[PDB]
UniProtKB/Swiss-Prot annotation, chain A:
It comes from Mus musculus (Mouse). Interacts with HGS; the interaction bridges the interaction of STAM or STAM2 with EPS15. Isoform 2 interacts with HGS and AP2A2. Part of a complex at least composed of EPS15, HGS, and either STAM or STAM2. Binds AP2A2. Interacts with AP2B1; clathrin competes with EPS15. Binds STON2. Interacts (via its SH3-binding sites) with CRK. Interacts with SH3BP4/TTP. Interacts with ERBB2. Interacts (via UIM repeats) with CORO7 (when ubiquitinated at 'Lys-472'). Interacts with FCHO1. Interacts with FCHO2. Interacts with SGIP1. Interacts (via EH domains) with DAB2. It is found in: Cytoplasm; Cell membrane; Membrane, Clathrin-coated pit. The EH domain interacts with Asn-Pro-Phe (NPF) motifs of target proteins. This is Epidermal growth factor receptor substrate 15. Phosphorylated on serine upon DNA damage, probably by ATM or ATR. Not required for membrane translocation after EGF treatment or for targeting to coated pits, but essential for a subsequent step in EGFR endocytosis. Ubiquitinated. Involved in cell growth regulation. May be involved in the regulation of mitogenic signals and control of cell proliferation. Involved in the internalization of ligand-inducible receptors of the receptor tyrosine kinase (RTK) type, in particular EGFR. Plays a role in the assembly of clathrin-coated pits (CCPs). Acts as a clathrin adapter required for post-Golgi trafficking. Seems to be involved in CCPs maturation including invagination or budding.
Swiss-Prot record, chain B:
Changing E216A: Strongly reduces AMPH, SNAP91 and BIN1 binding. Slightly reduces EPS15 and auxilin binding. Changing Q91A: Reduces DENND1A- and DENND1C-binding. The chain holds residues 701 to 938 of 938 of the full protein. This is AP-2 complex subunit alpha-2. Belongs to the adaptor complexes large subunit family.
Length: 5, 247
């Protein structure tokens, strides 16, 4: 979800 | 850092000049020192304004720029002599030509010596030349941002600081501070619209350092999480250090 991992 | 009360120090107003270039750096009861600066690539021009607040001349007025040893290697400053006689109520200007050789942490010292009424007057103040002044903002799309974010390889190139807010957590001031710090301010990258994202390149003579940042406010806790990811460890560290002081 979280594009920053 | 440096213990004891920061009033009457060499750095009372330093932090007010990290995200902006103009204003009053120093003012005692005789002398006001103002600044105006501009930066491009690894270079800058800083105008230093010396205002005589009195009704009598200053004599032998002599400002000097001093750079501590590692700073010497990383920053080159060039300036011309200032007229040593400053009328009461007048201002004299100095222009400082700045070249960033490599990334740096320390700040130059401006020393000013003059005679007033036959007395020796001596002032030393840190000059706000900071690494972020050498930013080129780099706008880019969210897909390009995350591809670059995930190219970090060296763990030392990522620096995070979770810290208490020192100032009100106002959205529009925060935006202005990031833009003033010098990176691009990228919207529509973090899916949380309350967070801030930046990207830019720090320019130095010998190395260009690509930089990505993320600022996550926690309003109820009055906290921030700041993350720096850049292509050089020491740049991630200094930029996190500088930006953290601003919030």
């Amino acid at each position: 979800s979280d594009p920053f991992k | 850092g440096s213990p004891g009360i920061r009033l009457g120090s060499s750095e009372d107003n330093f932090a007010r000049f990290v995200c902006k270039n103009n204003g009053v750096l120093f003012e005692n009861q005789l002398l006001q020192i103002g600044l105006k600066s501009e930066f491009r690539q690894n270079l800058g021009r800083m105008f230093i304004f010396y205002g005589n607040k009195t009704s009598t001349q200053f004599l032998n007025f002599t400002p000097t720029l001093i750079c501590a040893d590692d700073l010497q290697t990383n920053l080159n400053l060039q300036t011309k002599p200032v007229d040593p006689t400053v009328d009461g109520g007048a201002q004299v200007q100095q222009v400082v030509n700045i070249e960033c050789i490599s990334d740096f942490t320390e700040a130059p010292v401006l020393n000013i010596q003059f005679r007033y009424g036959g007395t020796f007057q001596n002032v030393s103040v840190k000059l706000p030349i900071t690494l972020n002044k050498f930013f080129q903002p780099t706008e880019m799309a969210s897909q390009d941002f995350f591809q670059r974010w995930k190219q970090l390889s060296n763990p030392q190139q990522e620096v995070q600081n979770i810290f208490k807010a020192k100032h009100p957590m106002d959205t529009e001031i925060t935006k202005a501070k990031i833009i003033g710090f010098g990176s691009a301010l990228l919207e529509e990258v973090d899916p949380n619209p309350a967070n801030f994202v930046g990207a830019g390149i720090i320019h130095t003579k010998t190395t260009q350092i690509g930089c990505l940042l993320r600022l996550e406010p926690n309003l109820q806790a009055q906290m921030y999480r700041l993350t720096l990811r850049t292509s050089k460890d020491t740049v991630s560290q200094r930029l996190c250090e500088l930006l953290s002081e601003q919030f």
